[PDB]
Amino acid sequence: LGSARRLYVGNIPFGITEEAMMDFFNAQMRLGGLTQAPGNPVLAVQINQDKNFAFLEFRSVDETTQAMAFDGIIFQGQSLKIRRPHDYQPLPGAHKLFIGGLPNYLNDDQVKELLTSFGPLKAFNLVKDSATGLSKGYAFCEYVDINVTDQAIAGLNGMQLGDKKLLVQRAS
Amino acid sequence: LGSARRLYVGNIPFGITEEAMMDFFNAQMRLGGLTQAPGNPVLAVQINQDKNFAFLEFRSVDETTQAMAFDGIIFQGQSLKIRRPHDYQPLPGAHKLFIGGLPNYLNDDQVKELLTSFGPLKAFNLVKDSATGLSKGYAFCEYVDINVTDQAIAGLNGMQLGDKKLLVQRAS
RNA sequence: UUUUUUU
RNA sequence: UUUUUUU
């Protein structure tokens, strides 16, 4: 959703205004060259004064990520604790893998079986030609435990299938 | 409210303009290095000429406080009397205390009882884990008579509770 | 109660 | 479970 665009920042200075918070972060983002396009990343920032925390709202997912390098930064005597929201979890194509070099003959279930070995998948799609309808020789997938991704890359990449050499790498 | 952002300045020079007042204070704030962020602290200043006083409006709570060191400053032959507004009183988390090292077993009423001893509280919260729901081992509170704060720190800090050493200090 | 306390 | 995780 939009949780990949918000950040929790705790241990905020007492009585700091929401605007002062915004100005500080947009400025840090600019001074570091961390923005992806022209204009300010931080759109808004809501403060829960008693609970001593604020949430930063960003315009983009990547900039939300980039700002995390500011964890611990000193601002008005307080060292800021920047964290992702609790409802947060990586977006659907976050660790999606590209698997090419597949023999044209294998079908979904067959291809999936070769991947499933390293663990259960959360998403998968084998590209088939519009008219023809058979495999185009490559597919995309993604495991549930996003940590098994690298283990799967190592094990599957380069593997010999038919007269083809498999190619596995993150699709992004 | 916004009373932690205004200041009463009495004994102002006769016929002084509101703008001259503003320029004088923003300049003092800059010459002393008393500002927290770029830009002028003093946003506005209203003068009640007959009553011989003006109020300064600041952009931040801390800068409002910082300017008070200018009490008695000579300006156009008159020694300025800087004071907080009368409606003023410290903001909700002003003297909030952090209390850590609490045994996970104690509950709100139990924890509160250990604090209440030094006087009545105006605010209190014991942090409990989102799912689990039990104490995370630390709480925040604040007494009504904000003077008992130090007396409570001395008495409670370091106290032995279970197999833990209590830690009490202002939460800011 | 020896310089005036307001949105 | 030693600084408080929300649209």
Side-chain angles (χ1 to χ4, degrees):
Chain A
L1 47 155
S3 290
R5 283 192 288 195
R6 322 198 105 221
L7 285 189
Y8 162 91
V9 40
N11 188 235
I12 61 177
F14 187 67
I16 191 66
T17 67
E18 296 182 322
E19 194 193 9
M21 210 79 244
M22 205 173 127
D23 301 343
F24 183 69
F25 281 95
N26 275 328
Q28 288 295 158
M29 285 279 96
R30 295 197 162 244
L31 275 184
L34 277 44
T35 59
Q36 60 187 214
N40 295 339
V42 192
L43 311 168
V45 29
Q46 311 154 283
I47 293 175
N48 187 316
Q49 217 198 111
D50 179 64
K51 287 267 142 297
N52 190 226
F53 80 86
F55 266 78
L56 300 181
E57 190 187 337
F58 292 84
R59 64 180 175 177
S60 72
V61 183
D62 175 65
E63 292 179 312
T64 301
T65 302
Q66 227 65 213
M68 291 188 73
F70 286 141
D71 193 35
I73 190 163
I74 190 58
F75 176 54
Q76 303 308 321
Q78 303 303 274
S79 179
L80 306 178
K81 189 151 150 191
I82 302 181
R83 294 295 128 96
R84 316 216 68 133
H86 274 161
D87 59 17
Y88 175 80
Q89 64 153 358
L91 298 172
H95 305 76
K96 169 158 33 140
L97 290 176
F98 166 85
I99 306 87
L102 293 166
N104 65 72
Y105 45 93
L106 293 64
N107 84 266
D108 287 350
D109 313 281
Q110 312 187 62
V111 180
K112 274 206 279 290
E113 187 184 312
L114 198 272
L115 308 172
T116 313
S117 63
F118 291 75
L121 304 166
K122 75 158 84 179
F124 171 93
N125 69 288
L126 171 77
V127 183
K128 321 95 154 58
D129 195 300
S130 293
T132 322
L134 359 171
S135 182
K136 302 269 289 79
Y138 67 91
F140 301 92
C141 79
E142 194 183 54
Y143 303 101
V144 193
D145 179 59
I146 66 290
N147 290 276
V148 307
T149 299
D150 303 277
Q151 295 177 297
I153 297 179
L156 299 178
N157 188 38
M159 181 190 225
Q160 185 71 216
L161 258 305
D163 56 358
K164 292 183 176 183
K165 30 75 178 177
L166 210 61
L167 169 57
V168 184
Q169 59 192 15
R170 317 186 90 94
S172 195
Chain B
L1 47 155
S3 290
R5 283 192 288 195
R6 322 198 105 221
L7 285 189
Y8 162 91
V9 40
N11 188 235
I12 61 177
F14 187 67
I16 191 66
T17 67
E18 296 182 322
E19 194 193 9
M21 210 79 244
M22 205 173 127
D23 301 343
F24 183 69
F25 281 95
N26 275 328
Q28 288 295 158
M29 285 279 96
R30 295 197 162 244
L31 275 184
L34 277 44
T35 59
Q36 60 187 214
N40 295 339
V42 192
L43 311 168
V45 29
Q46 311 154 283
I47 293 175
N48 187 316
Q49 217 198 111
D50 179 64
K51 287 267 142 297
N52 190 226
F53 80 86
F55 266 78
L56 300 181
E57 190 187 337
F58 292 84
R59 64 180 175 177
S60 72
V61 183
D62 175 65
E63 292 179 312
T64 301
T65 302
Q66 227 65 213
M68 291 188 73
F70 286 141
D71 193 35
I73 190 163
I74 190 58
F75 176 54
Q76 303 308 321
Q78 303 303 274
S79 179
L80 306 178
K81 189 151 150 191
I82 302 181
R83 294 295 128 96
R84 316 216 68 133
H86 274 161
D87 59 17
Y88 175 80
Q89 64 153 358
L91 298 172
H95 305 76
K96 169 158 33 140
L97 290 176
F98 166 85
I99 306 87
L102 293 166
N104 65 72
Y105 45 93
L106 293 64
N107 84 266
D108 287 350
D109 313 281
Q110 312 187 62
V111 180
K112 274 206 279 290
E113 187 184 312
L114 198 272
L115 308 172
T116 313
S117 63
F118 291 75
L121 304 166
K122 75 158 84 179
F124 171 93
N125 69 288
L126 171 77
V127 183
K128 321 95 154 58
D129 195 300
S130 293
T132 322
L134 359 171
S135 182
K136 302 269 289 79
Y138 67 91
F140 301 92
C141 79
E142 194 183 54
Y143 303 101
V144 193
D145 179 59
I146 66 290
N147 290 276
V148 307
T149 299
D150 303 277
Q151 295 177 297
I153 297 179
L156 299 178
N157 188 38
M159 181 190 225
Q160 185 71 216
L161 258 305
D163 56 358
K164 292 183 176 183
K165 30 75 178 177
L166 210 61
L167 169 57
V168 184
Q169 59 192 15
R170 317 186 90 94
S172 195

